[PDB]
Amino acid sequence: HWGYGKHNGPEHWHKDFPIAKGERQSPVDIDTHTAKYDPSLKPLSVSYDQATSLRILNNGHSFQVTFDDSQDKAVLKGGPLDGTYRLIQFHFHWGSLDGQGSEHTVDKKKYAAELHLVHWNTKYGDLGKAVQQPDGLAVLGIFLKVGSAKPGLQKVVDVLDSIKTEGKSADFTNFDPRGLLPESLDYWTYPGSLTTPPLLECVTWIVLKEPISVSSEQVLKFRKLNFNGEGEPEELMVDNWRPAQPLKNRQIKASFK
Numbered sequence: 001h002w003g004y005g006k007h008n009g010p011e012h013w014h015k016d017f018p019i020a021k022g023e024r025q026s027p028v029d030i031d032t033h034t035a036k037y038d039p040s041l042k043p044l045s046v047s048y049d050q051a052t053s054l055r056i057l058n059n060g061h062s063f064q065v066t067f068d069d070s071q072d073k074a075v076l077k078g079g080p081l082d083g084t085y086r087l088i089q090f091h092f093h094w095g096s097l098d099g100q101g102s103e104h105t106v107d108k109k110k111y112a113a114e115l116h117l118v119h120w121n122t123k124y125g126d127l128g129k130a131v132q133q134p135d136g137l138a139v140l141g142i143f144l145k146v147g148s149a150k151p152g153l154q155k156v157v158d159v160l161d162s163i164k165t166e167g168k169s170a171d172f173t174n175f176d177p178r179g180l181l182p183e184s185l186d187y188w189t190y191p192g193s194l195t196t197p198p199l200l201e202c203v204t205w206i207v208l209k210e211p212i213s214v215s216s217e218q219v220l221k222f223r224k225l226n227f228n229g230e231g232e233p234e235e236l237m238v239d240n241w242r243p244a245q246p247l248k249n250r251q252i253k254a255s256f257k
Ligand SMILES: CCN[C@H]1C[C@H](C)S(=O)(=O)c2sc(S(N)(=O)=O)cc21
Pocket: 059, 061, 088, 089, 116, 118, 127, 131, 139, 193, 194, 195, 196, 197, 198
């Protein structure tokens, strides 16, 4: 029932998911001048060379690319984390125009889109168990700005026409998610939540400082997707982002000066 529209969007979510008004909700604005450089923070370790993508899917809220997480193949470690987190899926949030679409903001600046690579802590055995734990997930957030094309995104773009409406999926094997990463792995980090229902407070957020650039043609393809199912009144999948939430009793730490 939940969505991004006037009658089911972020302002309505708390009714079915009261934790929407909790103490560690995401996304947040990253105030670069308030964030503290923490020299104790380790470099991120992104090990994606054995990543095995499975399928790409329109779920009525975003599109996602899913991975085989039945063993340690695509994993995130290091940074603020202890232990190993397996990549399960990635998805995006984007806007109706280039001046909005990101969930996190940087000094109130909104990017055109935001990529989330979702990982779960192997010590909990599966994703369903992990989301019930304060250190269950690590989500790697990457900003998208519009400019030059991102070659590593093109295979994704190429196939969106085949998953236009809710419930559609396609084979999406042999995709290398390394092609979506920026040069630098400098990051901000803070304790937060899923940004969609059920909004569980189970996420260590790792948001990269460096955006990737994607082309206008690439993000236009995102905006042609549909929230609706096939045969239903067409409502473009645009503006599928939750606004910044109160930081409350939290510190955002920077891995860089
Ligand atoms: C459709 C809702 N999906 C939820 C629950 C899934 C179990 S998930 O894969 O853990 C995940 S990751 C994010 S986000 N936007 O914070 O990165 C939202 C969700």
